[PDB]
């Protein structure tokens, strides 16, 4: 008969569905695709697509609900077809704005928004961006917003990605890429002592850096204070022209270009 059949959705969207359907043999002058939500009491909207394509795509629509898609083709020039129609549900909202909280050398922290569909939880991946490495995964409750991803390494580039769980599929992800920071100096340890110097050495972290940063600081008295810049194959620091008798903080950055560890720190008393 002059009815479109197997009129089916092949591809859905959050905000599109993709439907097609058998062509007839004999041609058709054009189409009359109406839709609307399953349900709701608002108007239809509807257009027309020629006779020589079988396929239409229905834009502009919501996520995560149940939508009634109608079919007419029209031969007169006029004489419409009986209708055929499908339902189909759209697929559910993503998070949005996901937010990087916290950097580390192994971990970090991310919130985001709500998605604005029903969720019954989260599924958070990290992957490394260039490096194949493997992917983690994580999941949270439906009133999570935040996560933090344990286990990475320093100064990694990796992708986080945040899907909305719902038993009518699930949703696309939202991404954002963060780089994980590099390790402390480890064992700050204090050589030696005269009344104007400091020497300090330290173990240098796993990652190849571009220098250090080295300051001392009186915590209690007041007076000058001393900044020196290392060069990346450095163990060890002397730092002179301080004052006698005075309570010296001394911290020691790890710098990879952009990239600043967390200090490692001590503190010491120059000689009498």
Same mark, same amino acid.
């Given at each position: 008969?002059?009815?479109?059949?197997?009129?089916?959705?092949?591809?859905?969207?959050?905000?599109?569905?993709?439907?097609?359907?058998?062509?007839?043999?004999?041609?058709?002058?054009?189409?009359?695709?109406?839709?609307?939500?399953?349900?709701?009491? &608002?108007?239809?909207?509807?257009?027309?697509?020629?006779?020589?394509?079988?396929?239409?795509?229905?834009?502009?629509?919501?996520?995560?609900?149940?939508?009634?898609?109608?079919?007419?083709?029209?031969?007169?020039?006029?004489?419409?077809?009986?209708?055929?129609?499908?339902?189909?549900?759209?697929?559910?909202?993503?998070?949005?704005?996901?937010?990087?909280?916290?950097?580390?050398?192994?971990?970090?922290?991310?919130?985001?928004?709500?998605?604005? &569909?029903?969720?019954?939880?989260?599924?958070?991946?990290?992957?490394?961006?260039?490096?194949?490495?493997?992917?983690?995964?994580?999941?949270?409750?439906?009133?999570?917003?935040?996560?933090?991803?344990?286990?990475?390494?320093?100064?990694?580039?990796?992708?986080?990605?945040?899907?909305?769980?719902?038993?009518?599929?699930?949703?696309?992800?939202?991404?954002?890429?963060?780089?994980?920071?590099?390790?402390?100096?480890?064992?700050?340890?204090?050589?030696?002592?005269?009344?104007?110097?400091?020497?300090?050495?330290?173990?240098?972290?796993?990652?190849?850096?571009?220098?250090?940063?080295?300051?001392?600081?009186?915590?209690?008295?007041?007076?000058?204070?001393?900044?020196?810049?290392?060069?990346?194959?450095? &163990?060890?620091?002397?730092?002179?022209?301080?004052?006698?008798?005075?309570?010296?903080?001394?911290?020691?950055?790890?710098?990879?270009?952009?990239?600043?560890?967390?200090?490692?720190?001590?503190?010491?008393?120059?000689?009498?």
């Amino acid at each position: 008969s002059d009815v479109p059949r197997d009129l089916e959705v092949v591809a859905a969207t959050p905000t599109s569905l993709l439907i097609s359907w058998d062509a007839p043999a004999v041609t058709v002058r054009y189409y009359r695709i109406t839709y609307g939500e399953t349900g709701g009491n &608002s108007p239809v909207q509807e257009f027309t697509v020629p006779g020589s394509k079988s396929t239409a795509t229905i834009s502009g629509l919501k996520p995560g609900v149940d939508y009634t898609i109608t079919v007419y083709a029209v031969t007169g020039r006029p004489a419409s077809s009986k209708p055929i129609s499908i339902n189909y549900r759209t697929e559910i909202d993503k998070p949005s704005q996901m937010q990087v909280t916290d950097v580390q050398d192994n971990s970090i922290s991310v919130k985001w928004l709500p998605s604005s &569909s029903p969720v019954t939880g989260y599924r958070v991946t990290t992957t490394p961006k260039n490096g194949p490495g493997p992917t983690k995964t994580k999941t949270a409750g439906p009133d999570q917003t935040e996560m933090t991803i344990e286990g990475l390494q320093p100064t990694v580039e990796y992708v986080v990605s945040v899907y909305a769980q719902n038993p009518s599929g699930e949703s696309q992800p939202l991404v954002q890429t963060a780089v994980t920071t590099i390790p402390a100096p480890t064992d700050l340890k204090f050589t030696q002592g005269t009344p104007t110097s400091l020497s300090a050495q330290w173990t240098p972290p796993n990652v190849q850096l571009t220098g250090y940063r080295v300051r001392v600081t009186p915590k209690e008295k007041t007076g000058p204070m001393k900044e020196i810049n290392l060069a990346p194959d450095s &163990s060890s620091v002397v730092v002179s022209g301080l004052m006698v008798a005075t309570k010296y903080e001394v911290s020691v950055y790890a710098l990879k270009d952009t990239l600043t560890s967390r200090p490692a720190q001590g503190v010491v008393t120059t000689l009498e």
